[PDB]
Write a protein that binds this ligand. Structure first.
Ligand code: HEM
Ligand code: HEM
Ligand SMILES: Cc1cc(N)nc(CCc2ccc(CCCN)c(CCc3cc(C)cc(N)n3)c2)c1
Ligand SMILES: Cc1cc(N)nc(CCc2ccc(CCCN)c(CCc3cc(C)cc(N)n3)c2)c1
Ligand SMILES: C[C@H](O)[C@H](O)[C@H]1CNc2nc(N)[nH]c(=O)c2N1
Ligand SMILES: C[C@H](O)[C@H](O)[C@H]1CNc2nc(N)[nH]c(=O)c2N1
Ligand SMILES: [Zn+2]
Lengths: 411, 407
């Protein structure tokens, strides 16, 4: 089967054969599309086929398919599964797996960078303290004084699912949220619940607007423990605007390092439940969503006020106007402090080039349009006009339920 | 089977049960989602007729009544005898309104039941079609206080006798390739303009030349008519602050009127069924003006604004995009021509969704199309999960007739 995707801006038509290697499900059927739905303990039995698939891929990527080294490694993994019910990945296979999960991440506009990924192997980690040390080294290395480098840290795989490693935080760096008695929130509304858990776990909340939350870490199925990331390791950029000098008086800042820490890395059937990964921000992630979502810092009002826009009718597009300046501000602030960041035009242009390349070299690029198109100025970015095919390839990054819903407390 | 949709801005979770009536296919499988692709007999007809008539008589609180069964019989008799059948006016009205109700890409459906339907099933020639269309345009324009409408020409019979409007909208600006390499007017109609020229159009070779209608009655070769200029309401585009905006000399038409689609009611196919409502501002300002394949005026507007076009990171495209869109909305409101902003339109559609979940058990919605093409995440539809599925009656796309026709 061949599938064609067309670009309506340029009339370029590409052909997807890669979707034939797709295993997992989409959520969709012939009768329903779930493309806009946010979220649409293995036996030896299901495991070896998955192991075989991965190693055949691995071994094709290094040009050694059907080699003695390939067949030997197959035999080796076979025996290891039937003996221990699992297996261990060589370092090289871990690295390749991690790179490919990113590459396969259909909702990531940033994948032109997929091959430049520093993989830290934290598979020898046994304790929360160990996890905290690994995570600090990751932050420091990834930050690199503002010259951000992509990285991921891979803690030990699931075994019985009773001994899971987990970073309770959704991202390694995030600001606290405090729901107040009057129903207002101080700080980041997205993070209220997690903030409460942390408080419960004994964190002394500063109760400010931009309190970096403590890491909350579980090793080996144990109850999790709190650690404050050293402040010096947390690079932050104060937000100012190039023309509007009152923009600084809003007191805004953000952190430099986007680092997702709640996802599950699946490689060759193995499940890595703690695998924090980081890159660098696209400006709209902070300036549209983090500041201007209604259920977030929600500063459109205050900014429109200060610009003295006409706020009596939405047809003044006052919101659209405030939104753009806020985003100009984020990009200006990051660049000024020499903290890596990419604007939404640049990021989506790169991504189209990546995708084109991927269709030639690889025969596809699974892509989720709902997520790839930016949350402002959609159609003046080249991705709006690009037909995409969404399908799931392994290795992959998967969502997993928040651990406080499932965790069995030791006490 | 029962399906939940969550709004991530409000936590409201609605349960969709209406998709279980889903008739047609989506393009997707369990293996591949095609959510972002633009275009994924007598025996056949009685089920489709019955399905429709069942929902009709159910809509009017008379499911399984003599009148219901009698009509089911009558149509059954007529199909077996004639190989087609005819809708009662009431069925036509209900059908048309529901094709709109079921259009999963339309953000404007809160309005679906206020649709004026013009039964044009007695039309027999292109001149007739032209008369009906002019009357549509006039009724719907309504001196700028625009009103939704559809005009339904006769149904397909043997497909050798289709009625078609070759225009994609009733009202569009022409497009001409220039020896200068560049394109004069609207580049999305260049081919249609050559077919018009080719069929004898006297093009005035300007930038905003209202194209002529090209009408096909009874599968015959289509003919040309110029909509009375006096019936094509236009709006010159000015900005409430930038006085130099006028000098780009942009105008846009008031009436969005989709003419190229096929309407399916109870198995019957109406190939010429132009319909119209009114614009959401971004269709003109973001898409018609700023798309690279369209009038593409961003570069020129940003220059007059004297913004830094040296680097994409100054967001100069975005700054210019907003003003262009302020200017569209401003010029329409000033000339008193109905237009809706994307905030208002999406806010309306969320209220509609809730109504449709409550009163119908769902609302098929295609997020890719529902979320405006600018400022997506500050409109509420961005955070709203949607389920997209195909219900009948429906508007379907259909191939441009120049490819299908024989002369
Ligand atoms: C290097 C710079 C990077 C940029 C600019 C980039 C950009 C993006 C953006 C804009 C999104 C959508 C985020 C949202 O709106 O919430 C995204 C999602 C994603 N990215 Fe990338 N990314 C980068 C690096 C990476 C790296 C290094 C990985 C993994 C190694 C990755 C994996 C993903 C995954 C798994 C998602 C989806 C997360 C989810 O569904 O919650 N990203 N990225
Ligand atoms: C009354 C004011 C109306 C508003 C503000 C409205 C708004 C919209 C918008 C924003 C789109 C997406 C179009 C694009 O991006 O080009 C749309 C598409 C659509 N609308 Fe509505 N609409 C209205 C009236 C109607 C009426 C009266 C009908 C049918 C009788 C209808 C049927 C559709 C269909 C079938 C599509 C998609 C057709 C396609 O795939 O091109 N619209 N409309
Ligand atoms: C590594 C990386 C780099 C980069 N530039 N961006 C990212 C995306 C990070 C990210 C941050 C925050 C969020 C939460 C939304 C707030 N904006 C997300 C989406 C997380 C998410 C939430 C839900 C409900 C489901 C899901 N699959 N994923 C994803 C990762
Ligand atoms: C009735 C109505 C009201 C309103 N406010 N807006 C509309 C949408 C009209 C419209 C305008 C422009 C366009 C495209 C312009 C680019 N050449 C379209 C739809 C075009 C289309 C193309 C294809 C390939 C498929 C499809 N289903 N629809 C539809 C209708
Ligand atoms: C390729 C992609 O599906 C295409 O650009 C779509 C995206 N969303 C859209 N949304 C609307 N409302 N109108 C459109 O024409 C499109 N185009
Ligand atoms: C319901 C809908 O899928 C949801 O709002 C999605 C839309 N697109 C998105 N796109 C990105 N990049 N990040 C998001 O959180 C979302 N949210
Ligand atoms: Zn789908």
């Amino acid at each position: 089967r061949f599938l064609k995707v067309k670009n309506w801006e340029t009339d370029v038509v590409l052909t997807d054969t890669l979707h034939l290697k797709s295993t997992l499900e989409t959520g969709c059927t012939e009768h329903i599309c779930m493309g806009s739905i946010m979220l649409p303990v293995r036996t030896k039995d299901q495991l070896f086929p998955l192991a075989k698939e991965f190693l055949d891929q691995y071994y094709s990527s290094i040009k050694r398919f059907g080699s003695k080294a390939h067949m030997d490694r197959l035999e080796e993994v076979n025996k290891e599964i039937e003996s221990t019910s699992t297996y261990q990945l060589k370092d090289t296979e871990l690295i390749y797996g991690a790179k490919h999960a990113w590459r396969n991440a259909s909702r990531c506009v940033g994948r032109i960078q997929w091959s430049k990924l520093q993989v830290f192997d934290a598979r020898d980690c046994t304790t929360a303290h160990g996890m905290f040390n690994y995570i600090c080294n990751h932050v420091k290395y990834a930050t690199n004084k503002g010259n951000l480098r992509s990285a991921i840290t891979i803690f030990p795989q699931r075994t019985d699912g009773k001994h899971d490693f987990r970073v309770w935080n959704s991202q390694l760096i995030r600001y606290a949220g405090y729901k107040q008695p009057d129903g207002s929130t101080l700080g980041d509304p997205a993070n209220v619940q997690f903030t409460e858990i942390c408080i419960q776990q004994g964190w002394k909340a500063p109760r400010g607007r931009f309190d970096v939350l403590p890491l909350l870490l579980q090793a080996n199925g144990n109850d999790p423990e709190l650690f404050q990331i050293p402040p010096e390791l947390v690079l932050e950029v104060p937000i100012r605007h190039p023309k509007f000098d009152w923009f600084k008086d809003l007191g805004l800042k953000w952190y430099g390092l986007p680092a997702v820490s709640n996802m599950l890395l699946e490689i060759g059937g193995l499940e890595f439940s703690a695998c924090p990964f980081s890159g660098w921000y696209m400006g709209t992630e902070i300036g549209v969503r983090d500041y201007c979502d209604n259920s977030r810092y929600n500063i459109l009002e205050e900014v429109a006020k200060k610009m003295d826009l006409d706020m009596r009718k939405t047809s003044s597009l006052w919101k659209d106007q405030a939104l753009v300046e806020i985003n100009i501000a984020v990009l200006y602030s990051f660049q000024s402090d020499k903290v890596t960041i990419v604007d939404h035009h640049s990021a989506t242009e790169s991504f189209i080039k990546h995708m084109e390349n991927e269709y030639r070299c690889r025969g596809g690029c699974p892509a989720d349009w709902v997520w790839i198109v930016p949350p402002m100025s959609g159609s003046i970015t080249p991705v709006f006009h690009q037909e995409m095919l969404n399908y799931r390839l392994t290795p992959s990054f998967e969502y997993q339920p928040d651990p406080w819903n499932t965790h069995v407390w030791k006490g």
